[model samples]
Target: MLKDGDYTVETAKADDHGYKAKLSIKVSDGKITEAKYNEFNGETNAMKREDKDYNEKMTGVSGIGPAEYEPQLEKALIEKQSSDIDVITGATSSSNQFKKLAEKVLKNAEEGKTEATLVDLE
Candidate 1:
């Protein structure tokens, strides 16, 4: 049996609305205790330049885009303790990205690996 103090950490990335997503999670005793998701709009120099303004605009409104929707996905992962839960209505794509990363995170946790894991969604 896994010890109560057993824990693991992992990070994975997925494609998002013209951006890339990074998900970090912490699991302990077979349950996800914490998770966070962030989407990056920069894959090149020009995109990087525009990321700042994009973040500002999207984060200002709830459900506007990946920036705000990440928190909702995180909450769902922690509450459900599984990625089989339904996706958020308007942010369906991003929600799928969250599930993909969560599945990888849980896999790493089961392996008892502390190193960060990275996955690219095509």
Candidate 2:
């Protein structure tokens, strides 16, 4: 229970271009009471500078390599509005990184009042 309310992590995933995260916020009392989620997109260009290294080291690899994706993922997380996002050391898949997950989780709030779940059920 927070005096100011806060977001809760649900599901998240990341890719070369961006990452997506889902989250829920818990609110109590009449003024704040809702649980909602959204998808946020995050991007990173850190790998662009090391295109050669990425291409060579990741040759034949099915997915983006750490050398290329690590910085990109980190950049994406850094770009996120919230500080909760964190990137993994060597995991190319954004899914392995908490930062990417956090980025997307906040996205759901972008469109409008994200307190959809708080609406009176009765």
Candidate 3:
């Protein structure tokens, strides 16, 4: 039951990596709505937050570069968007996750579900 403007986005960060954002979006009534995400911006340098310490910690984790971290980090973003989660400061890439999520949500609204979920991660 997604409306044209109804949307939700989450933000998170991994150790030694860019910030991540996930958009739990519903849009256009099944027209490319309701999807999970892992590519906040695909740039890894757009995250931002207030907790510098935590941001650095997550950044270090990203350095591990394990494939599993991708989904784990996406889950974190889901929690963030669905609750009162806070972004890690110092990790601008992570902090800006919310923004990225919102961006995709808007994209879905404009394009379609597939387009919104256009970007893929390895």
Candidate 4:
């Protein structure tokens, strides 16, 4: 009898390049059950995690890219049931953004705010 609902918030801090962060999570049985964290770019399109050339390019150097780290962020949050999470090895900025959103959304869930939250980037 704790919490059960979906919590989503978007358009957090942004860069001039149109990069943005959004986090969505589900709370059930008073704990986080599922979540996804992501960064967006251009007309609000998901920055491709699997961009063929770039994926291979970055993986060659950084060993991981969005495809790998984005989910890692979500995994850490649900497992910890808290916003506190480690920064992904190859995705420093993304990791920070994800944590910020996770903490904010977690508080929202704790209070049972199921409504989606829309934030302004500009």
Per-residue lDDT tens digits for candidate 1, residues 43-74, read 54233223556656655544355545667888
Query: Which model is ahead, 3 or 4, in terms of TM-score?
Result: 4
Give the per-residue Cα lDDT of candidate 1 at 79: 93
Clashes of each: 0, 4, 20, 0
* Positional deviation of residue 55's Cα in model 2 after best superposition, in angstroms: 8.0
Question: By the lDDT metric, which is better: model 1 or model 4?
Answer: 4
TM-score winner between 2 and 4, please give it.
Answer: 4
lDDT of 2 by residue, 66-117 (tens): 4455445435443543535444444434434444334443443442234322
- Per-residue lDDT of candidate 3, residues 1-122 (tens digit): 22454454444343344545455655444343344544433364442333455446655865422123433444554444332335444343433544455555655555434432432221
Which candidate should be chosen as best, given lDDT against the real structure? 4
Model 2, TM vs. native: 0.26
Q: What ranges in model 4 sit over 4 Å off?
A: 42-44, 118-122
Off by over 4 Å in 2: 1-59, 83-94, 98-122
Please identify model 1 stretches exceeding 4 Å from their true place.
1-18, 42-63
Worst 10 residues of 4 by lDDT: 42-51
TM-score between candidate 4 and the true structure? 0.82
Better of 2 and 3 by lDDT: 3
Per-residue lDDT of model 4, residues 1-122, tens digit only: 33788889886456675777778888777878889777766476757574667568767887887778887888888888887888888778678767777767877887788787765534
